[PDB]
């Protein structure tokens, strides 16, 4: 844990009233596969905030992958106010015990979805 980072650019399509979380890449998180690599997968959902578990495409034998991967957040900015953005780097290792790699906790009230949210966001240690 203390995962490294995942830089993103999250945008709003407001006339479907949904947020968009198009990250970039996560970099150099611990390997859960038999090749000193991982098969990254990002869990992205909220509570009654929008409990929509979306999923990154699995990046085989690399935990430092760059997708620019859209986390579909079907909640308006006005609706953001209550909402809690949790994001979870999870390794789908298809065989062994799946280790949760990392996570980040992102409260809506701190995230400005006026236009495009571009900042380099770090994967913090998850203990799940």
Q: Can you give the CATH number for the domain in which 10 is found? A: 2.60.40.150
* Helix (H) / strand (E) containing 80: helix 77-80
**Backbone phi, then psi, for 117, in 5-degree steps?**
-90, 105
The total number of residues shown for the chain amounts to: 128
39 is annotated as contributing to ligand binding: yes
112 is annotated as contributing to ligand binding: no
Tell me the CA end-to-end span of the chain in Å, nearest whole number: 11
29 CB contacts (<8 Å, ≥6 apart)?
3, 4, 38, 40, 63, 64, 89, 101, 102, 123
Coil, strand or helix at 35: coil
Task: For the chain, give percent helix, strand, coil, nearest 5.
Answer: 5, 45, 50
49 is annotated as contributing to ligand binding: no
β pairing state of 117-125 and 100-107:
antiparallel
* Helix (H) / strand (E) containing 54: strand 54-55
118 CB contacts (<8 Å, ≥6 apart)?
8, 9, 10
Tokens found for residue 93: 């290792």
93 is annotated as contributing to ligand binding: yes
**What CA–CA distance (Å, rounded) separates 86 from 112?**
16
14 CB contacts (<8 Å, ≥6 apart)?
76, 77
Q: How far is CA 12 from CA 17, 61, 81, 88, in A?
A: 8, 32, 15, 21
**What CA–CA distance (Å, rounded) separates 100 from 16?**
33
**What CA–CA distance (Å, rounded) separates 57 from 21?**
15
Residue range of the domain that includes 98: 1-128
11 is annotated as contributing to ligand binding: no
97 is annotated as contributing to ligand binding: yes
**What CA–CA distance (Å, rounded) separates 109 from 101?**
26
Coil, strand or helix at 64: coil
Q: How many CB atoms lie within 10 A of CB 30?
A: 16
- Please count the structural domains in the chain: 1
* Helix (H) / strand (E) containing 91: strand 84-91
57 is annotated as contributing to ligand binding: no
């Amino acid at each position: 844990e203390k995962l490294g980072k995942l830089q993103y650019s999250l945008d709003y399509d407001f006339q479907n009233n949904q947020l968009l979380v198009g990250i970039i890449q996560a970099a150099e998180l611990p390997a859960l596969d038999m090749g000193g690599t991982s098969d990254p997968y990002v869990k992205v959902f909220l509570l009654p905030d929008k409990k929509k578990k979306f999923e990154t495409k699995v990046h085989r034998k690399t935990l430092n992958p760059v997708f620019n991967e859209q986390f579909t957040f079907k909640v308006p900015y006005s609706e953001l106010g209550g909402k809690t953005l949790v994001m979870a780097v999870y390794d789908f290792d298809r065989f062994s015990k799946h280790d949760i790699i990392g996570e980040f906790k992102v409260p809506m009230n701190t995230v400005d979805f006026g236009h495009v949210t571009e900042e380099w966001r770090d994967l913090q240690s998850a203990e799940k």
